[PDB]
DNA sequence: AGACCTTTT
RNA sequence: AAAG
């Protein structure tokens, strides 16, 4: 249909070129708008393109090209490993990737745009075939509804299915099938596609003799597809997400080396419940292999990986003596029947470790639930409310103290954000025109030369267009904090020493609050949740009871595996395979909490349908034999295509529920818990084969939850009190009866105290030594009267320009500014033995002679009260060495000047600040070194 | 006698001019009169009422013909005017040294030299009576080569008098002594102004008359306290003396005095809670506050009325009240507990985080002794030193690769954050930093590289040999699974004997593994000193979940029949801190041994009992027989404290000769150490050890009036025949000795000159203006010559110290200046009039540029350490790339305050290496939820 | 053959 | 300069 002819065409005279030259060779092509299937321009294979290690190289002078604009270039590592490395390189793999509908011509339905090549993590099945054969695309759904589409026939859903699975697709010298998706402004899925065929292929190992694989074949390497028949074909399509899982391969285990356990932990109750879902241990030695191929400084207590079939967490074993290296799998991890042969079947591969805890906060998400469940609920808002306050208070306030010595002011500048991955990329502090392009980094390094925030009023304003954007910010984000709160991977008690309703924490550091410190948790009550929390007894009350036995176990929170149900299903249905739950021991959100019962779930089947239609069921349909199991895999794949590419339940039902709940001010009302249960079969859709449409939608809406199609808009979802009277959802309250007066009162104050000759000015005498020293020489001079007079008059030309291009008003803001710097840069002494020793010349800098200094000196008196900021984008970077040479004192102390790189890589001493201040108010002997 | 001649005119005169003088400018006045031998008593004299209202030293000094020191730091001298010597807890001390006088002419027999106004951490006594009402000095101990004549005839017993029996009068006070202890040797003396012309029978020059006699009285409570020893009662002067910070003023209903201390399960009597109660929560608490802490201390090392000792928090304290307890093991007079200065909580020390150890000489003997395979011992021990001596080396090699890596290398080999906040600034000697390590980031910070520029390689080699000289010396072999640690008893008997409890309050790294706690394992534990092989235990950690809070503390069981505490070499738990030691390598080879059968000494040991009471019925009662009697302590307590000490001739006594044995367990070696543990605790137990003593034990049971030769390790060599056989030769000669001169060839062989065509392209600059030039040449050439007279003056083997002798000759490098040479408009360029700092202008780089090419190679160490400064800003402006970012000059203070990033470094070289596409490192690139997978399935 | 050690305020 |  339209579809056909969208792939871009493989000239045949690159059929000898490695495809990563007709990777970018068929990239510049695109971009540059040019048919290669021509003899117009009469191209043929420059062999200089085997063996290069530059992509420019390979672009690099005929008339089609000539002028046209250049795409993104692929990274030298990557190309070099492309060409060189058969696409691997120290665990990373060069990754083939591609991704939209504009012209409404009835005779190509997309625009391809092939992505450069890059490194991305491997997985198993590229560290078993090869990346070179795997392709990835990003394709917007047919069932989406924002319209941007030509969508407007019946079968196109099914069209577009056909066109990816039916049969192969040619692009490279390559016949890519595709054997995977899933869903990643329009609504985009990712397509992965597997070379089962090429040109450089053996008809039957490196890049360039790849033998013909099937798809059908590889699947059935991944699967073992001959024993899992039984399984529902679309969950069996699901398990090709863990042959596509980035995991780091840490290992290789013998088959003497694995137990597999043919039963869960069950429960003691006799209830046949496991209590041991995705959880397994590993032996001391093989997590320390972790941490050695890692690079971890700690042997990890747990991961979360996949082992052949097996997914889930494996925790060490606290009763490991030895140190020989073992693994074992249960049920519950074990996603299909595997033979754990093929050694990439038997490697441990990692997908994270538990790492140290950072401080979660509380998510506004959790506080319907936790207010269902407060004994007091109107105690529990008031004290929200006061955190609340006095977190906003302390904020604001400890910014305008730090603002009056200017040491303390570098901290809180460094503290409140960060520049450090920016300082790593570019080598240094990135500059645009003659200050840092932040207004972080333009703050300590004016300061770092001398300047005063309370003196120099050009710091003063930028330090109050943070603080007001921050304040902007703190009202469209409401933040909880709670310091005695962490996500915490969740491990199952495998040494029954944990009782029903007690957990195990143990941090593997210092964890700090303000005024308390942990390195775990003993004799007090914790709340233990999953985010999104959704039924009232998705919220745990326990207790934390450290045990001896397990204290090498860090960085985890253990569950007890007594009792009749595991913690870890009473948390929205959870389990230990990679599940984090939110912990918090904060006092004042525990003793308030009173625990639910486990809800009485609907019977959702009239609205929900599963289709549990197994592979060898839809194998029948074709036969018995390899043909038969080969093209029952192609259906699958199709099949489950159709299901993939279905519109997102999951996210419209969760809205419901958030404006349902909203609007009814209860979560545990009858239509909370029906919609509560209904978000939760629907997490897996494509999984467990749920299919749910618009119209079973409609039903369950009208006829359970109340009738409303269409719900409206929570009033915490705008940045302005729209209601009537108070507010009163909880959320509703926080944000405008308590931090939105709260910031305002601030923001008040901030312009009251914007509103005397007793404060920060633009003018500074030191800035304006250089125009003044040479007044007093071309004073009695004629020469260096015409070279002032000259230079005075262009940086008025210059400061015109500024007006002009920057200041009033198409071209990008940094380019504009750049222009203006150009010419500033150009006045010069050469344009007008005193001018050779203001040029320096022998500095390959000129940015660093002593022309920059006067001409800086020369603008800023000229222009420090009319037009502040030219001076300073201009100029401050001179402006400061200026001040840092004129606040030298001989004796007190020597300046020092850094390198652009050497500068980046410092930081502000917390200690010497605290020290510092301390000496100054008279604390001067305190307690040293803690 | 006369000593008595010599010993009349000693202090400083106090003239009639300076009465109506604060004591702050009459103790400065004075010294300046001193140091300039003008004389106080000199007619050839008015106060300057501009002094009493100074905040400046130099204002009361510039206050003439005759006039052609160390100056008091001006916050100092502000609150010695104005803050009533006190500011935040810090005292203003009024300090002097005395030495003996060359002068033999029976003049003063001592030379005083007022040391200038300091501030020190306030005491009990400086708190409740006044900081301007005590003088400490140092004194030359009577009892001691270089002893003058007049002090060696006859002396001691005449200085003792003129110390006790009368006040001496200085800067308009009269001064009673009360306490001495030892800092030739010297002594250290305390006095106490008792009377003064300002002085009346409060404000610090309106002070009511108050006796030496009184001030101990109220400190001491002698009335309830004349069953005492005195010699013991004089001791416990220094609990009022500690440095302490005060904390809070508990109320009486709020402290708990327990009347019997906890005791053995078995009935033995022995104390198992010696020196340690427990407090409240909040009271560690404020605590915290007070003392600005992160976190609330487990236990402190304090003091509180008559207690001395560690206090720990109640883990059973669920309340908030404030609330202490004292024992009777902590009680060291009896107290009432009325003043509020005796109610107030003195902290000197808090548990803190432990760092780790490294294995001294005085354990290895013993650790020997109790191995159960020597061999095997000796192996490990110096396996240990030979690795951690390759990755010391390994670490730093590797580093010095990369500046940005060196860089934080240095800053992590040195702390320097206390001198910086000190001076707010890196304090520079000349053109370049003090110190070396601070000279290397500096440099490197302007874009030297450390294996490009020979200046900065040769600093590092000289460092690294320094510390590998050091290691040769002390054998400090750094044990990662070690740590000194407070020691605490459990209060709630949940430890059994043979287990202690060690929690940590953060994670202790040692290489591979790291840890919060130790449990399920054997630990080493022992005080320092160690010397009878029973001075080292093995015990078994157990981690108590009902202990958890307490942390960064060792906790020791209060069951069993001897507390362990006590077989540590007869220690307690009042501040006492313990070597523990968890290294598998050295722990199970250990076998523990029985306490020490100690042979009785009384024959040698003399124990001076007298109480208070019997020193008192030569007097009668009534206040008057007191305060004499009191009078009487102090002396005779003198008399015994400034007696000669022999612990030191005692101790080098059984290391020469356990050397000679190579046995730390024969019969002269538990002698020896049966002896030097009562001599420790001579000064308070009273115990008289004269040299005819020392020498009676000598010949009747060790060796004689033999003069023992030092040990083969005391020496740089092994001149010793044969191979070396005891356990610190064998480690010094043949394990530290090859392995450091095996490290130190491959260290140079991996590091670079010192000549920079950048440092050298103003010299260059001016090249090509002088040839054009007559008049430049004139300059250029002028400048160059008298750079050559500053490096002669620089250069040879001089009393000056070396930083005056250094600043003299930097002070006439800073003296060459565009002097007269007559084009102006240049010479003004040059000169940069308008800049403060004259060594921050133009002239200056060229200054330190000529220089680097006159004498690159010649004397190097001149250029560098006059114009460093100057070079670090030439090589930042000559390494500068257009659009390759912007250096910067940040001013001494800003650049104080700054520190290197490890992460900065860790993800730049990770990202330059090639291999920063793998695992996030969480340490290195930091809901608060951080990596959690690299994709999504 | 000649007067202690340890780690921190 | 402390403390053990
Ligand atoms: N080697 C050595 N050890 C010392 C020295 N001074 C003190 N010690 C040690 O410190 C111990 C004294 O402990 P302290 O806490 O001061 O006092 P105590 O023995 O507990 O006695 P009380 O003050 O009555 O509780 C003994 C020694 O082990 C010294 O100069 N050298
Ligand atoms: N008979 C069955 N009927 C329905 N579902 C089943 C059946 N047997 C197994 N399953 C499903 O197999 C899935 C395998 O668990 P899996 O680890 O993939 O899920 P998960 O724990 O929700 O994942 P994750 O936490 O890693 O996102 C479960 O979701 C479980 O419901
Ligand atoms: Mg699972
Ligand atoms: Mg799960
Ligand atoms: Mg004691
Ligand atoms: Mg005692
Ligand atoms: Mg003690």
Request: hydrophobic letters at 35%.
């Amino acid at each position: 249909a339209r579809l056909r002819n969208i792939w871009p065409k493989f000239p045949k005279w690159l059929h000898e070129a490695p495809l990563a030259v007709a990777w970018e060779v068929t990239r510049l092509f695109m971009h540059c708008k040019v048919d290669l299937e021509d003899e117009s321009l009469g191209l043929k294979y420059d062999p200089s393109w085997s063996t290069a290690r530059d992509v420019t190289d390979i672009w690099k002078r005929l008339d089609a090209f000539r002028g046209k604009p250049f795409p993104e270039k692929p990274p030298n590592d990557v190309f070099v490993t492309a060409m060189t490395g058969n696409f691997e390189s120290k665990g990373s793999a060069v990754v083939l990737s591609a991704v939209d509908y504009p012209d409404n011509s009835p005779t190509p339905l997309y625009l391809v745009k092939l992505k450069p090549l890059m490194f991305e993590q491997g997985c198993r099945l590229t560290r078993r075939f090869g990346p070179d054969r795997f392709f990835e695309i990003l394709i917007p759904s047919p069932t989406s509804t924002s319209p941007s589409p030509p969508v407007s026939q019946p079968g196109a859903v099914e069209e577009v299915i056909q066109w990816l699975t039916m049969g192969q697709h040619s692009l490279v010298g390559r016949q890519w099938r595709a054997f995977f998706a899933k869903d990643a402004p329009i609504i985009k899925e990712r397509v992965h596609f597997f070379a089962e065929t090429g040109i450089t292929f053996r008809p039957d190992e490196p890049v360039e003799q790849r033998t013909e694989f099937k798809v059908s074949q590889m699947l059935d390497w991944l699967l073992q597809l001959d024993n899992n028949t039984w399984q529902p074909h679309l969950k069996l399509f699901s398990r090709i997400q863990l042959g596509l899982s980035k995991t780091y391969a840490i290992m290789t285990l013998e088959p003497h080396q694995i137990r597999h356990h043919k039963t869960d932990l069950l429960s003691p109750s006799g209830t046949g419940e496991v209590m041991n879902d995705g959880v397994g241990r590993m032996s001391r030695s093989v997590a320390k292999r972790i941490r050695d191929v890692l690079g971890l400084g700690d042997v990890p207590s747990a991961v979360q990986g996949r082992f052949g079939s097996a997914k889930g967490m494996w925790v060490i074993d606290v009763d490991d003596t030895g140190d020989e290296d073992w693994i074992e799998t249960y049920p519950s991890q074990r996603k299909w029947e595997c033979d754990f042969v093929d050694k990439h079947q038997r490697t441990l591969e990692v997908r994270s470790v538990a790492s140290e805890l950072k401080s979660a906060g509380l998510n506004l998400q959790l506080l319907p639930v936790l207010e269902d469940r407060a004994r007091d609920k109107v105690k529990m808002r008031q004290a929200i409310g006061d955190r609340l306050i006095n977190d906003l208070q302390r904020q604001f306030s400890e910014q305008k103290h730090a603002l009056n010595r200017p040491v303390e002011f570098r901290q809180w500048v460094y503290e409140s954000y960060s520049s450090r991955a920016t300082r790593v990329s570019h080598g240094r502090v990135p500059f645009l025109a003659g200050l840092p392009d932040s207004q972080e980094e333009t703050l300590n390094f004016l300061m770092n030369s001398g300047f005063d925030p309370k003196k120099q009023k050009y710091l003063q304003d930028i330090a109050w267009d943070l603080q007001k954007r921050k304040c902007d910010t703190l009202k469209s984000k409401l933040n909880i904090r709670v310091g005695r709160s962490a996500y915490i991977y969740m491990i199952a008690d495998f040494w029954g020493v944990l009782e029903e309703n007690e957990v195990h924490v143990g941090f593997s550091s210092k964890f700090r609050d303000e005024e308390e410190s942990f390195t775990l948790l003993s004799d007090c009550d914790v709340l233990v949740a999953r985010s999104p929390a959704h039924f009232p007894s998705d919220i745990q009350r326990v207790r934390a009871v450290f045990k001896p036995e397990l204290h090498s176990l860090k960085d985890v929170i253990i569950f007890s595996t007594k009792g009749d149900v595991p913690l870890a299903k009473k948390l929205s249905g959870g389990d230990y395979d990679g599940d984090m739950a939110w912990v918090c021991w904060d006092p004042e959100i525990v003793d308030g909490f009173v625990n639910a019962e486990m809800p009485l779930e609907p019977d959702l089947s009239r609205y929900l349908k599963k289709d549990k239609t197994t592979f060898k069921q839809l194998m029948a349909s074709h036969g018995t034999g390899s043909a038969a199991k080969e093209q029952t895999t192609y259906d699958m794949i199709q099949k489950s295509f159709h299901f993939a590419l279905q519109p997102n339940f999951l996210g419209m039902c969760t809205n419901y529920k958030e404006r349902l709940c909203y609007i009814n001010n209860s979560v545990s009302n009858k239509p909370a818990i029906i919609l509560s249960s209904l978000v939760g079969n629907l997490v897996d859709q494509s999984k467990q084969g749920i299919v749910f449409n618009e119209a079973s939608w409609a039903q369950l809406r009208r006829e359970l939850l109340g009738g409303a199609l269409s719900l409206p808009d929570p009033m915490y979802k705008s940045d302005s009190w729209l209601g009537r009277g108070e507010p009163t959802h909880i959320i509703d309250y926080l944000k405008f009866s308590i931090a939105r007066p709260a910031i305002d009162k601030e923001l008040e104050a901030f312009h009251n105290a914007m509103k005397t000759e007793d404060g920060a000015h633009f003018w500074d005498p030191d800035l304006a030594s250089y125009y003044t020293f040479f007044k007093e020489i071309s004073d009695k001079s004629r020469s260096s009267a015409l070279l002032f007079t000259t230079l005075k008059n262009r940086i008025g030309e210059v400061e015109k320009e500024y007006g002009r291009l920057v200041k009033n008003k198409k071209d990008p803001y940094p380019v504009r500014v750049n222009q203006v710097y150009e010419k500033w840069c150009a006045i010069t002494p050469e344009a007008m033995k005193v001018i050779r020793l203001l040029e320096l010349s022998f500095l390959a800098d000129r940015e660093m002679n002593t022309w920059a200094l006067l001409r800086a000196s020369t603008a800023f008196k000229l222009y420090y009260h009319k037009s502040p900021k030219f001076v300073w984008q201009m100029a401050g970077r001179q402006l400061a060495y200026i001040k840092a040479q004129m606040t030298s004192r001989p004796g007190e102390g020597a300046p020092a000047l850094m390198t652009a790189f050497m500068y980046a890589g410092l930081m502000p001493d917390k200690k010497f600040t605290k020290q510092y201040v301390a000496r100054l108010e008279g604390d001067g002997s305190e307690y040293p070194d803690p």
